Amino acid sequence: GAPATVTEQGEDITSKKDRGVLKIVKRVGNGEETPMIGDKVYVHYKGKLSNGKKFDSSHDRNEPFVFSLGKGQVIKAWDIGVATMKKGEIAHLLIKPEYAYGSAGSLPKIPSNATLFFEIELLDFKGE
Template identity: 40%
Template sequence: MTTIAEGNKVRVHYRGTLEDGTEFDSSYERGEPIEVEVGSGQVIPGFNNALLGMKVGESRTVSVPPEQAYGPVLEEALTEINRNLFPEDLQLLEGMPVPLTTDQGHKLLGRIQSLTEEV
């Protein structure tokens, strides 16, 4: 059976969770696997490295450190976001991950550090 190597194109299902078990992304939720060219930089390095050596049908659970994912938390990247930018019926909680999109259309995962009441 062939093992995955750099340059291979693969279709893979994945589920991304934080250390506390909170799911932040899932191909299962979208109903189809992603297609990736291994080694092309399409996915975070830790995910790419986890694919290397896998075989068709194999499942693997990996823990990816920040340095091989999206990087450490940058205090200078903290910003305030008005509550009205979120759906009214969404209950916001400290520590909750929130998907964000930059002005350039890049998708990011943010986390609520704190909530304050506007006076």
């Protein structure tokens, strides 16, 4: 399955090189430009616990997810990962709990020490 493929073949886009954030590009985007900190970002995503019952998606509510990149308004893995993406890129991220919700987790949806997997499509990014 997809998490497996990322474990085995995904690249470590973390600074510390601690395999906390692994990424495969599943569909290439357009241009060479990727978003700066503070840029307004527009994405679709599907997320799940790497092995678990909780599953979440923006496609479901058919509204794009919008956040300000690099400000810690999302889990750290997203600030790291989305910054490496180009407009129109779809990527797969596998994320250790240190770059996600840690030991404390976040009920109802996230257990303790949870590894997360996301498919993310980067739709657009605009200047602050």
